[PDB]
């Protein structure tokens, strides 16, 4: 049953979207605002006032104090807008490259495994965004490995902190330790923790 | 006297084509030339394939010159914000061997 | 003076001036001769203007802008001083102004 | 306790959102080892060069920096229709 209107012009709308993505900073947040609204309208996740970070009664325990302070330093208060934004960021296009909100963790205390876990969960809940920021999280993980596993760390980093896939798909590790910057995300380089090459 | 003189008698005579003793401004007052990559000013080259004479090499005054200038997008000396992050433990801080 | 050309009523002066400007060895110009966009931001930064100004001041002003441009330190380098003045293993972040 | 609410509900929300009209990019292929975003520019012989994806640092929009601690409220400070008398449309 025909509708008297013009066909949705795919080839043109995609073009205008690219021109906008080039020239219009607002575009990202325009698109996010739809996705975010949708998350909110699906009523899928809501904050509660009841936190659940620790088993009873580990918070009371005096031996747990360093661990508990670690968790409390990581665990943010729930806010619907921020949660929805995360779920929406997962699907929204990225134009300005994302960066990690840098941790300063030194990984001396055992409790610091919390930060590693903070990433693992992020890699699970948000694999897309994770992949956007993973070099920046490799910089934290390296401080983790050089303390917890200094020998293996030396072998790894001796292989190279990054690699570049070439023709025919072979990896080519740099052989050179060097801190990642998000400048590299648009380059040929990859964080080497994620090479999954034994 | 009047070593400082650049122009004289900016009028025209009604008989002779230029007034006796009238002086035109020197060409160097008007050669903007170029800012050399080094940042020194230069007079325009007098011929093809010649670099221009640096303006400070010679004693003529030049009154049009290229001045580099920073724009609105630059800014210098503005105070800048940072996130300080203190160490989690004083006893975890190695001082040496560095 | 180069501006007087075809504006001064004084004939010989306009003739002498036109004569100097029509030489190959000299060429007046006034305005935005040069531009230098940032490599990342793609916005303009250091622009060269042909001002009416003595070559000495232009030389000095360019010496200054050159010292500031060619040093290759930024506001972020201030962090290196803050580390010296804060406890060992204190971290500093942002904003990478470049 | 929280997983069914993710897998059996939130995943569907992702699958739909993925087909929304404005989600035009390929954000990820599921392989961290090899995925690299496709990179386009508006560009002319006259010399204009506008990358679609640029690295510009934090922006006024606030979408650029990522606080990964957002993971915590989710695991331990959020209800869901599937997880939580327990019937809920």
């Amino acid at each position: 049953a025909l509708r008297p209107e013009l066909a949705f012009d795919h080839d043109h709308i995609i073009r205008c979207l690219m021109l906008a993505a080039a020239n219009y900073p607002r575009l990202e947040g325009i698109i996010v605002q739809i996705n975010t609204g949708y998350v909110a309208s699906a009523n899928v996740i809501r904050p509660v006032s009841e936190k659940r970070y620790f088993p009873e009664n580990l918070e009371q325990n005096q031996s747990a104090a360093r661990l508990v302070s670690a968790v409390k330093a990581r665990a943010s208060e729930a806010d619907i807008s921020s949660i929805h934004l995360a779920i929406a960021r997962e699907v929204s296009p990225m134009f300005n490259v994302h960066e990690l909100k840098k941790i300063a963790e030194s990984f001396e205390d055992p409790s610091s495994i919390v930060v590693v876990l903070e990433f693992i969960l992020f890699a699970l809940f948000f694999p897309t965004e994770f992949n956007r920021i993973k070099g920046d999280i490799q910089n934290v993980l390296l401080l983790f490995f050089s303390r917890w596993y200094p020998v293996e760390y030396g072998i790894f980093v001796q292989r190279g902190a990054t690699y570049t896939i070439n023709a025919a798909g072979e990896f080519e590790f740099s052989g050179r330790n060097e801190k990642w910057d998000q400048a590299l995300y648009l380059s040929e380089h990859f964080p080497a923790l994620f090479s999954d090459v034994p | 006297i009047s070593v400082a003189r650049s122009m004289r008698a900016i009028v025209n005579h009604n008989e002779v084509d230029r007034p006796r003793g009238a002086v035109a401004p020197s060409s160097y007052e008007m050669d903007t030339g170029t800012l050399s990559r080094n940042g020194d000013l230069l007079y325009s080259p007098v011929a093809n394939g010649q670099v221009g004479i640096p303006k400070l090499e010679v004693d003529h005054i030049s009154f049009s010159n290229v001045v580099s200038m920073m724009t609105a997008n630059i800014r210098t000396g503005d105070d800048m914000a940072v996130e300080r992050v203190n160490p989690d433990d004083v006893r975890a801080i190695n001082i040496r061997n560095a | 003076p180069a501006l007087l050309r075809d504006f001064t009523q004084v004939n010989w002066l306009n003739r002498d001036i036109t004569n100097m400007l029509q030489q190959a060895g000299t060429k007046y110009g006034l305005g935005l001769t040069e531009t230098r966009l940032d490599y990342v931001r793609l916005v303009k930064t250091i622009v060269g203007h042909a001002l009416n100004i003595d070559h000495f001041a232009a030389s000095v002003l360019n010496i200054n802008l050159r010292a500031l441009m060619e040093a290759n330190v930024t506001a972020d380098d201030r962090i290196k001083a803050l580390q010296a003045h804060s406890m060992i293993s204190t971290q500093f972040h942002g904003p990478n102004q470049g | 306790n929280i997983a069914v609410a993710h897998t059996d509900h939130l995943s569907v929300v992702y699958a739909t959102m993925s087909n929304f009209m404005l989600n035009f990019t390929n954000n990820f292929s599921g392989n961290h080892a090899t995925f690299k975003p496709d990179q386009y520019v508006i560009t002319s012989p006259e010399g204009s060069y506008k990358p679609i994806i640029e690295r510009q640092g934090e922006t006024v929009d606030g979408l650029t920096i990522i606080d990964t601690s957002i993971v915590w409220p989710i695991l331990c400070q959020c209800t869901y229709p599937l997880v939580r008398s327990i019937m809920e449309e």
Partner: peptide, 15 residues
């Protein structure tokens, strides 16, 4: 403590 996607600035450095 609270989620904040921006850099959490606290100090200033004068030139």
């Amino acid at each position: 403590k609270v989620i904040f996607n921006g850099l959490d600035v606290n100090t200033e450095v004068q030139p």
